[PDB]
């Protein structure tokens, strides 16, 4: 029952803060085949190893993908204290984890290209007492609150985003800022893999 990886091969991959999630759950996968459609630049794991990640059988397998510039390689790792894991995308620290940076080659042509790389570089709430700023740090497996006020791709590098919240939503302001990195000749992406094992139900084995 092949895992459907094709939707990754078709269309413009989102920016990092709109990371696209694929959840596979009862199928056979050939990961070391998918990666063979790309030029893998970095492949870093955590509680697993690139060899094992492709080999083992899981109860669940999560694949996040997004446009992401090679030039920001240091901002995408478990250990990074940067703005990416702070405001855009943080994966779980308690499930074994992987992090691939790859480039789509001239070979593969069905992946359209955003206008540039964006990422949220600050994201805060201005509480309604008018004098408190509370940084909205992204939780694992979730989106930043600021996804609602930031465009699919940041227009220009300094762009500042400000939104007033209804007393329902807490009642302050939700404020954000985005940064851009110029588009590269061939598109460069980041893939996050997240696996879950046990408890008797590891049916995402490979083919």
């Amino acid at each position, epitope marked *: 029952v092949e895992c459907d990886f094709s939707p990754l091969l078709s269309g413009t991959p989102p920016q990092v803060y709109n990371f696209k999630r694929l959840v596979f759950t009862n199928c056979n996968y050939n990961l070391t085949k998918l990666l063979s459609l790309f030029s893998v630049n970095d492949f870093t794991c955590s509680q697993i190893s690139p060899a094992a990640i492709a080999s083992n059988c899981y109860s669940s397998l999560i694949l996040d993908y997004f446009s992401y510039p090679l030039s920001m390689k240091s901002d995408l790792s478990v250990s990074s204290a940067g703005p990416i894991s702070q405001f855009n995308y943080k994966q779980s620290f308690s499930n074994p984890t992987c992090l691939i940076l790859a480039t789509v080659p001239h070979n593969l042509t069905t992946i359209t290209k955003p206008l540039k790389y964006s990422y949220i570089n600050k994201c805060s709430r201005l509480l309604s007492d008018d004098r408190t700023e509370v940084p909205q740090l992204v939780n694992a497996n979730q989106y930043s609150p600021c*996804v*609602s006020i930031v*465009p*699919s791709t940041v*227009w*220009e590098d*300094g762009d500042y*985003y400000r939104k007033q919240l209804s007393p329902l939503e807490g009642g302050g302001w939700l404020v954000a800022s985005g940064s851009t990195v110029a588009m590269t000749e061939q598109l460069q992406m980041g893939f996050g893999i997240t696996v879950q094992y046990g408890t008797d139900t590891n049916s995402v084995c490979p083919k």
Partner: antibody
Amino acid sequence: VQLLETGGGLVKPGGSLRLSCAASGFSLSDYYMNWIRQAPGKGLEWVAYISSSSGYTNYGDSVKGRFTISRDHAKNSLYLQMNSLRVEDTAVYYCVRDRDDFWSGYYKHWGLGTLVTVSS
Amino acid sequence: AIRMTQSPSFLSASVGDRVTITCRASQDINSFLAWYQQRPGKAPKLLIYGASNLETGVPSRFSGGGSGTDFTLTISSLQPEDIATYYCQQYDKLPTFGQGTRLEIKR
């Protein structure tokens, strides 16, 4: 807050025009400034923005490389330089400003407009 | 470009009616959509920013709703001065507008 367009009129195809927008009640380069056009009897089409503080530009597909959006910190004015003008470029050109200091996208403030006819 | 598809192109209703104009984007635009009113011979007036946010100084009989790819403007309790063309505009990518909806008042 007022927006006063000017500089339009009849121009021959192939020709040029520098439309100008005199702004007051606020200061450009704090806001995203835009140009919007409207052919006679037809609907609206965005043609260019010059970003806020720092002035980065961008254009519509139909006008890219021909039109050029500029600006001047003193005289508080906004320009649209339209070259190699086409019959199809005939429209009322609106000078429009971002709703807020920060990036907004939409516009409360439009100018009255200026008509640009293109024909022999 | 992103294509905004607006409907109906033209519509007629008597005073007091509810009217609903519809806009569809060819991709998710996340509540980044405005509605404008253009009264015969003038610049457009801003009605709704956000997907649902009422710009101050427009009567509360205007209301916007929707998110993702499907949006409605809803004037409910139509009044004689609401005669105009209504445009929608997405600002999630370089701006694009709906084709237009003319609102005629029965009488």
